Amino acid sequence: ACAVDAGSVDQTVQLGQVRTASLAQEGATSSAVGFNIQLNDCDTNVASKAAVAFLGTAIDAGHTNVLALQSSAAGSATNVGVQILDRTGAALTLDGATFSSETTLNNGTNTIPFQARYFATGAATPGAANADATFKVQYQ
Amino acid sequence: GVALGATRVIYPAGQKQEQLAVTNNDENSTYLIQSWVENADGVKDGRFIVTPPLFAMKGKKENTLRILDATNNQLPQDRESLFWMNVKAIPNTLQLAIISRIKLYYRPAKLALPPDQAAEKLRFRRSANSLTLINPTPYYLTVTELNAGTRVLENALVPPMGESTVKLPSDAGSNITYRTINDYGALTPKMTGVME
Amino acid sequence: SNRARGYIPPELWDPGINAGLLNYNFSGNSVQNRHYAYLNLQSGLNIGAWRLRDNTTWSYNSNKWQHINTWLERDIIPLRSRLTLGDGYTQGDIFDGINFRGAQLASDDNMLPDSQRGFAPVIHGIARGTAQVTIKDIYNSTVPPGPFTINDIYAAGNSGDLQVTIKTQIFTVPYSSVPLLQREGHTRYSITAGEYRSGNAQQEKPRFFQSTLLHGLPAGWTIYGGTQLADRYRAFNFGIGKNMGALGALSVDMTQANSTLPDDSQHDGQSVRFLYNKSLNETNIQLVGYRYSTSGYFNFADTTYSNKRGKLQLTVTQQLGRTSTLYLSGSHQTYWGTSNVDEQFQAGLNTAFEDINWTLSYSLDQMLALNVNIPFSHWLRSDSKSQWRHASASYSMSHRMTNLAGVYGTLLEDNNLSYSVQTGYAGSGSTGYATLNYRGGYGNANIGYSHKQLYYGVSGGVLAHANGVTLGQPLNDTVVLVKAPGAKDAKVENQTGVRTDWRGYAVLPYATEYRENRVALDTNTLADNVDLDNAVANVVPTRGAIVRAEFKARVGIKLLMTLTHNNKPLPFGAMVTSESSQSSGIVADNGQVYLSGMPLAGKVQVKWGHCVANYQLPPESQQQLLTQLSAECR
Amino acid sequence: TLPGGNMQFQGVIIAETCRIEAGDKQMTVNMGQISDSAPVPFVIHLRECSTVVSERVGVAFHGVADGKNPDVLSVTNIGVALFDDEGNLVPINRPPANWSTSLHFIAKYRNAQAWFSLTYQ
């Protein structure tokens, strides 16, 4: 019934600058940047709940819940990754079949917010940090 | 303690001002911060102004230093220029005043070679007991990890369009490896030396 | 008592300010086939510490004001929890997530420091003498002789083995992770009372009680219990989870439910949920979630009307070449009575080498997809300032065939104007898409043309605080109200299109709650005539708190003054004050003092430990960025 | 169940200078009264920075020079001499010479302030 908002298909989110002080050892985090997935022309009768599934490359086997960083000729960061959190503050895995917190769909424009941040899987080395993940919207 | 936001500051020509952060995370120390800028030789010069030149910080706090240009377009537009930014944090007995020096790269707009590719274009010349680094790139090169076989050499800084000489032991290996530091303060992966 | 890494005393948390909050979101869809108006309005009042929130919807086809939620949430620091009165929802980690209207008292994980989140075994034991105990380097410090309880181990998920070296008994602490596990000495509780609310009109509205408890016993054990009582449904859930270290982690819970059907018939049932997370092998991470529901087992959702024989989920992830991520997922559901079985298998291979990001996915009817993402930054030099560098190409092919090739990125100075033009083809339908999103300092406006559909939407927020009304981007829970009077058009940092208006008040839509966040005003894009006393502040807001970060700005022209007393530069540390604009400063060196916000003509007062210096400036100095004058003091 | 699209995250990471934390409170090394002399040790800790950045740090001393000897800090007819852990004299007002995250220095008689300069390569 509903259709994902056009423009939300191709979305770019800027995390700003994070100094290496905030990423000391494994488990350290950084500031969070808000973003959302828009939904328009939703019919609640056909589907009443919505969920989002994220699919993306993992930085390492033991940290599948953290994205991987693309190599850059200018020098990308090392042992750092991108972490995605739902509205409940819980980390989301990137296995491709883990639906986030199901949210009740409403008639009209629907917004499902999420958060992104930097997760240090090791010693932090400066450089560019470019990542990308494929998100899937599921209707119930 | 006092801490600088970045290790080196890139100042693009044409931009009015630049920003740099100064942080302190010791909630029980009073710090008088003083700032200034000196030329390549370490002599105080008025070509750059830091605002505020001096102020006071108490508790866990950070301030924003603003760097203003005053060269008034009296510098070349074909090569980068070097300056030294100095930040001092003033707290019988001896008092320890900590002064930190960081690099300031004044970078013109028009440039043929992007900064990333400058590292791979460095050239070497092996003399009898010294090594000379020919750098026809328009960027300052901060060469470290200058390893010569089983003998490691001293780090060096080569200005653009120039050559710098470093000592060379006779037992140093034939192959030479070096690394370059980018604008973010990270070591470029090891690269071999292209002898001419 | 060692404080946890990242702990802030609760007295440093700002409850907020007395303010009215409004969040409007209007959308208009004009579809011309060879008009729908939706409006979502969130009203709110932050009086004292409570947070009154209300949601309203209005629609128009080409008037129906419909309420959605009205709730008063509050934070209780002594109970380390939050209280929700009104229409809310229950997470239901062990039970089923349900919406309701009533009183919910729930513990919160965010209020704890980031160190004490997730699962990480705590290190006990005694170190002889002064030992610099080292954990492989998550933690590195010493400890006085005697028993020590290291509990600052960060949540690292599966990971590997933590080597503990005392300085020398060397013992390792391998550990696994299950979401249902808890740390040692950690208690999570959730009490919910009130009526049940559901979207379906057919379902009844009974009053219910729910209790959920999660306790972390020592040595990697977790005991979790739950009780769901109602007029017709009575269930008790008991579960145990164990960390076996190298072997893995286990969680098993049984729920006994006496449930009454829509008919008067009464049924009894038991359900066993078994969850197993394999440790790291070789590389490969496996999650096995099984649920066996015997005949006669029902949930509270089925009880409030007017079975599942078994469920099996198996997820295997393997990383190869540090680039490719094999994702296998299998779901298999049986049924009671009906012998039909629902199966779903999904296998994906995602690889991102250099800048190219290519993903090939397969799913079972079957569906295969290939996605290629290529940022334009690969080809053109990053030195060039052409806006086209902030663009990327997406090429997708889905097998019916669906091809979609598009360019997308930003082309404005502040990366506010997000543009996306994507041609497509379905096999023969040619339905291209084009969208322009603008995120400015007065609201977000998104307009889209789809080959015909025309979307136009505006989202914004109104804050009625003490110092007037401030308009800004749509508000997301905690909002930071930045107040810098006299500084018009000052862009904040680490956010896109969040600018101060002529009043000088702006709003940061998002700031992490119970955490230290930096609010900085970028002086680079700020007017020369205005100077900020402090361009950075730090605030730690609470859930739904409007915290104010104050920055004082001097509006007069900046000025550097060379002061000499008795033909000699003023001594270091001399205080220079100016009552003309209430400005202050300290002499830096060589009798030079910097002063922000000074009038054209005035007199400054100097205190070495009492002198007056008159000064006047020609109007030409006002047009100059930084003026320097020399004024001998009396 | 329909595909959503791609979502890109972009940012940059920058290093930072090593913070200086002298052992004594407020960086005030108490020496004592005078009737070389008894050694007075002071420690410096370079904290919150990567090892590579910390390694490439040039440490130097400079300050007020005594009239009798420009290589000793001015304070009667005495001065403060600074020695490294190895005990060799480190002259004041000298070019940097790279010397891990914990520095140790000794002061001896033979108040004042000593500009302690850390250049970051």
Author numbering:
A (entry chain A): 20 to 159
B (entry chain C): 1 to 91, 101 to 205
C (entry chain D): 121 to 154, 160 to 187, 196 to 269, 274 to 304, 310 to 424, 427 to 450, 479 to 536, 546 to 580, ...
D (entry chain I): 7 to 41, 51 to 90, 98 to 121, 128 to 138, 150 to 160
Sentences from the paper on this structure:
Uropathogenic Escherichia coli strains use filamentous type 1 pili to adhere to and invade uroepithelial cells. The pilus consists of a flexible tip fibrillum, formed by the adhesin FimH and the subunits FimG and FimF. The pilus rod is a helical assembly of up to 3000 copies of the main subunit FimA, terminated by a single copy of the subunit FimI that anchors the rod to the assembly platform FimD in the outer membrane. The assembly platform FimD in the outer membrane of uropathogenic E. coli is the catalyst of type 1 pilus assembly.
To explore the structural implications of FimI-mediated termination of pilus assembly, we performed a FimD-catalyzed assembly reaction of pilus rods in vitro similar to the one for the FimDHGFAnC complex, except that excess FimICHis was also added at the end of the reaction. Given the low FimI concentrations in the periplasm (FimA:FimI ratio ≥100:1), we focused our analysis on physiological pilus complexes with a single terminal FimI subunit capped by FimCHis. A 3D reconstruction of the FimDHGFAnICHis complex at 6.4 Å resolution was generated (Map XIV). However, multi-body refinement with blush regularization in RELION-5.033,34 improved the resolution to 4.0 Å for the pilus rod (map XV) and 4.3 Å for the FimI-bound assembly platform (map XVI). The resulting composite model shows that the FimI-terminated pilus rod sits on top of the assembly platform at an angle of about 48°, similar to that observed for the FimDHGFAnC complex. In addition, the comparison of the complexes with and without FimI showed that the subunit in the usher pore and the FimC-complemented subunit on the periplasmic side occupy nearly the same positions when the two structures are aligned based on the transmembrane and plug domains of the usher (RMSD = 0.56 Å). The overall conformation of the usher also remains unchanged between the FimA and the FimI-bound states. In contrast to the major conformational changes observed in early steps of pilus assembly after plug domain displacement, no major conformational changes were detected in the transmembrane domain of FimD upon incorporation of FimI. We then aligned the FimDHGFAnICHis complex (model XVI) to the previously crystallized FimAICHis complex (PDB-ID 6SWH20) via FimC to assess structural differences. The angle between FimA and FimI differed: in the isolated FimAICHis complex, which is not restrained by FimD, FimI adopts a slightly different angle that would cause a clash with the transmembrane domain of FimD.
